[PDB]
């Protein structure tokens, strides 16, 4: 079946709940692609909030702000898989695993568009949910 | 609360099924924003397929390929709402309504990424469905 937007979301939600510490290299490489693709489903103006949420979840200090943010920025602007393939080659397994698990567990809760889009009418379109 | 990726999907799915022909201007303007935002959830390499699927659903001939593709390309590359606002100003209500309804009814069925991503391992991650 087609890899639709919804299929991506369902894939991210499944893997956010897995312990991927010993997953085979082929699957970990594919999860890096999933994180790259999903980062590009955020508008560029949300990347700073992605980074700050990532830092807070992982208990990182402001020391790690610039590095984490550059990773999200360079995934967002990547072309031809260039930066993605460099991260695979240049990061150790543990860092990649921790970054992937953090991202997948925050990516589905954070707003994916910024305020200029959200506050100018789009919220009047959002349909009713449970409980609610 | 947050306008997450899933919330965007649920909003598109809801409005794809509505008859929007007499919706108030404020909602039609917001649906145009939704279409622009959602176009940017496709990779640039999928825009040609979005255009061709649009043409087939609407019964348009190959004449309208270039204009439909330019619309998708210029929404995809838009900054600061510039092209989006020009579409609102320069298109008649009927054309906008038809384009919005066509897009929302094809966007949730088409692949959002191209082959270089899909065929090199991502498919092995997709979880089981009903």
Curated annotation (Swiss-Prot), chain A:
Belongs to the filoviridae transcriptional activator VP30 family. Phosphorylated by host. Phosphorylation negatively regulates the transcription activation. Phosphorylation and dephosphorylation take place in viral inclusion bodies and are largely influenced by the presence of NP. Dephosphorylated by host PPP2R5C; this dephosphorylation enhances viral transcription and is mediated by NP. Changing residue 58 to R: Complete loss of interaction with nucleoprotein/NP. Homohexamer; hexamerization is essential for RNA binding. Interacts with the nucleoprotein/NP; this interaction plays both essential and inhibitory roles in viral RNA synthesis. Interacts with VP35. Interacts with host STAU1. Interacts (via C-terminus) with host RBBP6 isoform 1. Interacts with host DICER1; this interaction prevents TARBP2/TRBP binding to DICER1 and thus allows the virus to counteract host RNA silencing. It is found in: Virion; Host cytoplasm. Multifunctional protein that acts as a viral transcriptional activator. Promotes read-through of an RNA hairpin in the NP open reading frame to enhance viral transcription. Mechanistically, nonphosphorylated VP30 hexamers form a ternary complex with the viral leader RNA. Clamps the RNA template and the complex VP35-polymerase L together, thereby increasing the polymerase affinity for the RNA template to increase transcription initiation despite the presence of RNA secondary structures. Also assists stop-start transcription at gene junctions to promote transcription of downstream genes. Residues 63-98 are annotated as: Interaction with the nucleoprotein. This is Transcriptional activator VP30. Changing residue 90 to R: Complete loss of interaction with nucleoprotein/NP. It comes from the Viruses.
């Amino acid at each position: 079946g087609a890899i639709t937007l919804l299929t991506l979301i369902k894939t991210a939600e499944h893997w956010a709940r897995q312990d991927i510490r010993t997953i085979e290299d082929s699957k970990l490489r594919a999860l890096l692609t999933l994180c790259a693709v999903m980062t590009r489903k955020f508008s560029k103006s949300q990347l700073s909030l992605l980074c700050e949420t990532h830092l807070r979840r992982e208990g990182l200090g402001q020391d790690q702000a610039e590095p984490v943010l550059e990773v999200y920025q360079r995934l967002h602007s990547d072309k031809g898989g260039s930066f993605e393939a460099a991260l695979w080659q240049q990061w150790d397994r543990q860092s990649l695993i921790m970054f992937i698990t953090a991202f997948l567990n925050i990516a589905l809760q954070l707003p994916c568009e910024s305020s200029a889009v959200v506050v100018s009418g789009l919220r009047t379109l959002v349909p009713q949910s449970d409980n609610e």
